Homo-oligomer: 219 residues x 4
Amino acid sequence: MYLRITNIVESSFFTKFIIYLIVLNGITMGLETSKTFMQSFGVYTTLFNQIVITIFTIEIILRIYVHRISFFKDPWSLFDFFVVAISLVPTSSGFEILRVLRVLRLFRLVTAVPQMRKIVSALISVIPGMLSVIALMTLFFYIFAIMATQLFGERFPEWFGTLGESFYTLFQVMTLDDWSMGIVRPLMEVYPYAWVFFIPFIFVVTFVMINLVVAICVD
Amino acid sequence: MYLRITNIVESSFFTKFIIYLIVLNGITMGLETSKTFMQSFGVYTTLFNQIVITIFTIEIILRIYVHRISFFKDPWSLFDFFVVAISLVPTSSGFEILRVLRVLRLFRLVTAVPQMRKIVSALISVIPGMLSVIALMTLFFYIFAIMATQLFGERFPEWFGTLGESFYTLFQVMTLDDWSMGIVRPLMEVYPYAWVFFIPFIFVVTFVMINLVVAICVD
Amino acid sequence: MYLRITNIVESSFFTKFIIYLIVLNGITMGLETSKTFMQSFGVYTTLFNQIVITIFTIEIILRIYVHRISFFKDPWSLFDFFVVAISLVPTSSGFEILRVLRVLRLFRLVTAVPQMRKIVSALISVIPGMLSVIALMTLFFYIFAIMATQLFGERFPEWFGTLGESFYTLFQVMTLDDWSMGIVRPLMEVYPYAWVFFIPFIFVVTFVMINLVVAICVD
Amino acid sequence: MYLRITNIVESSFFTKFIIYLIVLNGITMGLETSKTFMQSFGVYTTLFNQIVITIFTIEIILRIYVHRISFFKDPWSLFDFFVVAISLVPTSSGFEILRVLRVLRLFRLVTAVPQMRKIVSALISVIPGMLSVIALMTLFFYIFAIMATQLFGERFPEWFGTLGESFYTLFQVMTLDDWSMGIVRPLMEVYPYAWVFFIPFIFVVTFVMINLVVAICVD
Ligand SMILES: [Ca+2]
Ligand SMILES: [Ca+2]
Ligand SMILES: [Ca+2]
């Protein structure tokens, strides 16, 4: 019966039946957004939901017999497994991010369809080339975030009071987001020289960031 | 009479005459902005306007006898037809955006003058090569837009209350617009972890965007 | 006496002397900024200034005999003429921008010192290859600025009330500066569909500017 | 005794022991951030700090016998000498930035681990080819900053009141930060033409920066 199912799983039909459900379950999840819609056809789509979820574990069980070890060394398969696994954790208990994390299954449209896989893969592949830089910056952020916490967090604890807060504010400054009118002019009414911290910070981070784009434009 | 008019239409004088009317009517529309100018010479202008509109349909009628099907297979001609058609719906009735949409005829200056055509075409041609990425993005946006509506729409209905609002807000975050003081710091007064939703969102979206710029800086 | 002065003007000493005055007059202009400095050495500097102004016209007078027509066809020289000219309009009558426009003479450091001429020229030379785009864009802005003045200027006259205002506001959206919370969300409290105007505007304007950067990174 | 210590210093063990102290002290500094942690283990971590500070001077003393003059011509070594020296200045007297500047030693993780060294050097190397643009710009900034102080600093002293203030505000405009609703629209309530100063300023400054990115993507 093994080859019987290896023929079912690998069937163009099967993969297209899968892609058909993703597009349906996605259309259905956007409808679950409507407080109106749920009052009318809520029970329709709760069931439609549990239905698709079963079908998906059935596939994943089926997909594993056909592939075994090869399957748990496939990124896309591992993914598909974990994204359905999330979707199996009861509609209750623990955290309710798990209910919300269920919509991650629409990323299966990326998995199940090539060209997407190509594109995602194309993208992901650029990351290893960025890791020396990314490491550098994260060291850098860590260093300034400490500096900022101990220089400004007493008077400005919303923004710098804690190591994590400083990470966040520094991230915001880095996105050049509302940084002057929002953070540093305020800081300067108390610490006139705060500009000496944030201007060099900005330079380094924007400089570095430009290089990283130029590096991604030579690989 | 066909070759008589094919010799009229294809004439340098004709095209240049058309280009003459565009720049005049365009000048004319900027004057139609002034509440002052309109009290003085408003009548002068609406008639010159209707005049121009006639002249333009005559041309397009003529242009078609001289090209027949070849015409409705020309992007630039199709454009011109559709823009004048917009300008044909009476100043009355339905939606009044139609009166406003008239000013789209000044895009005929792009259409009637080469080099522009060159540049537009040059630009537009880059688009097909982005569609794999644009699909990827739209899926991403759809998925996060759904999560956000269900994670934040109850306490923050202005920004996330509805799927469309979430799309808009997410777009705003993506343009890195006033995203921290404006949205996430608020969000966090209620949902301390909202940073776990928006920073990864910001990274992915900015990463994808960098790749897409480099993809262009190659093809 | 021509060759006597053609030997004075073309001299290394002459040029390095000019450069020495520029850096000094520049230093002297940053000091004229301080109300403190001006209350104690204000006279020292106003005269130093009137001095340097003569020295510069003398040079330009000298420089002209030595080059004649060749001069009024050199970009860099023409510049220095007009810049010193600005500095000759008496400190009074007319407008006071002319007094402020005097500090433009510090651009002579670019004009009179090689390398800067190199870099400026390197930069400027890129401009011709952007002109098809710059035109394209201005048509676009002109068209949308007209649309916006008639779509939003009655309720929002600060921002869209006049053709030029729409130009300014549109510029701001294009720099993606404070565009959503500052302008479109407010606009949407009255015109729910305003998002239909500004999102496409943003896309086009952003797309085009990316291409333009890429164009420069080819030519 | 030289070859004995030259064999201690040059050892894989020594270097990796150094790398071990950095990641330990760095971890320990993140803990010194917590007001909680300090109330429990502050003594522990103050002493651990002085320990590491000794060990680092010992090394720098050692590293110098083994290299002599070769050492004070090594950038990376020069760095470490200075960085430890900052950490030597008592935890009292002078300023308190000297206490804060101590966290700079964690940059030794860049200095004491290649690839980092590689990456930093890769970056720094890009600088010399920017200095022609960078010089140009600071002239540009200096010129406009002076203009702005005399055009806007009387009615608007917080933003343009002083040359230094104009530099800061001009920087903010350059990052295009909240430049319009924050600065130029206000300015225009008093000086309608202030847009004539800031729009060109914006163009020039962004153009130059676009060129500089393209330059770095050539060399
Ligand atoms: Ca901003
Ligand atoms: Ca803002
Ligand atoms: Ca505000």
